[PDB]
């Protein structure tokens, strides 16, 4: 059940809606980008995973811009949905900011975020 | 001019179509995922960047699945479009495969890809 | 107290010995490199951190080679020692394997490891 | 010939001295850490690589602290020495700064650096 509202341990609220073809839409809120606004994501996942155990490998992208606030950056998560009694999404991510050619070494960040359904 | 057909130094062909709202669609071909097939991406970029020099921070996601071949993985690029006379997209990326809980340490890869318009 | 024996949640045993100049020596065991052998690390940390809260930013490197087994790879952790009543080391890492020029896209891995003193 | 003075395309000067056991010492200068000072590295590489083509997988660590200036950070490169007529070191890296628990999401950076012998 990849469709639903996912949370974090930090406090981020991740509302997603999967697709039959393999698309992935929803909204996103609640910092690393910027705390109090509602941002839009899009992404993809494979529709036919393995059945002798695997994770449904997915990923999405949030460009930090809406009608409230612009942060001139973009964040892309890349993880998998681990299936079980306890639903779990384990992701790496990358935050890329808009810099000049001189400051191009400090543009991209990295990290890890772990998602769950209950909060 | 972010809309168009982008290439690599490896040989990957990246056909993209931007949006006025901030969406990003197109196709993708030509390995790291798997060499000879045509894969679908989606992603986002900010619609209002800075004018006293910056890069348009973007990112997209390819789930390696189509009618020809499945690789059970997903790749997310996260970079910026550097504007000038010579158009340039400089990206980091992450390849996340579908593994079990035991092999969860070797699921995610990392790298860097540099894109251009001429080939 | 950065000097001592650190553990993981996976099961890796990390015995380290700090230095007054800023060096960092010890041993390492217990997979991602290869499970049952004893590998050698070296690394550095800054000797004068901040006192109005910070983490002692450190990092080290293990080349997976000893008298028992060779894996033709190297792993570099890069994190910080968060000070408190509960000692904590939070790290990113990179596993770089020895590949040819053709397979140079899949050489480097990435992940995250969280270290503690009690097991 | 891994022992010697390596350069970059940015301008960083990397003087290294290898070891027979597998150690790796030298100095480092010339930004991402901080521009005009001389920093100390340490690292490791495997002493017995493959002969049917491979890269000598290495890695090292610089803690940005000396008698001139402190930056409260650490950088770890993780790459391979590609052998040939044109010597080449291709690395990923991670810059980890000293942050509090609140700003722990923006501590680690990421990038890529490509090293050569001629400048």
Author numbering:
A (entry chain A), B (entry chain C), C (entry chain B), D (entry chain D): 16 to 134
Give verbatim lines from the article:
In the end, we obtained a reconstruction of apo-SA at 3.3 Å resolution (with D2 symmetry applied during the refinement) from a final dataset composed of ~24,000 particles and a reconstruction of the SA–biotin complex at 3.2 Å resolution (with D2 symmetry applied during the refinement) from a final dataset comprising ~45,000 particles. Compared with the biotin-bound SA, the density corresponding to loop 46–51 in the EM map of apo-SA was missing, indicating that this lid-like loop is flexible without ligand binding. We performed this 3D skip-alignment classification analysis of the apo-SA and biotin-SA datasets separately, and found a rather small occupancy variance around the biotin-binding pocket among the different classes in each dataset, demonstrating unambiguously the lack of biotin in all the monomers of apo-SA and the full occupancy of biotin in all the monomers of biotin-SA. We noticed that even after the careful scrutiny of the SA particle images by 2D classification to remove all obvious junk or bad particles, only ~20% (79, 289 vs. 378, 987 for the apo-SA) of the seemingly good particles contributed to the correct high-resolution reconstruction after the 3D classification. Based on the location of each particle, the 212,105 particles were manually divided into two subsets with 134,606 particles in the clustering regions (subset A) and 77,499 particles in the uniformly dispersed regions (subset B). We immediately noticed that among the 44,326 particles, 35,676, accounting for >80%, were from subset A and only 8,650, accounting for <20%, were from subset B. The fact that the contribution of the particles from subset A to the best 3D class increased from 63.5% (134,606/212,105) to 80.5% (35,676/44,326) after the classification indicates that a larger portion of the molecules on the GWI were well-preserved. The maps from subset A consistently demonstrated the correct features of the SA molecule, whereas the maps from subset B were of poor quality. To further investigate the effect of AWI on the structure of SA molecules, we performed cryo-EM analysis of apo-SA on regular holey carbon grids without graphene support. SPA of these SA molecules demonstrated a strong preferential orientation, which is similar to that of subset B in the above analysis.
In this work, we use SPA cryo-EM with VPP and Cs-corrector to determine the structure of SA with a molecular weight of ~52 kDa. Different from hemoglobin that consists mostly of α-helices, SA is constituted by mainly β-strands. Our work demonstrates that the VPP can be used in SPA to resolve SA in both the apo-state and biotin-bound state at near-atomic resolution. The atomic model of SA solved previously by X-ray crystallography (PDB 1MEP28) can fit into the EM densities with a correlation coefficient ~0.74, indicating the structural fidelity of SA in its crystallographic and soluble forms.
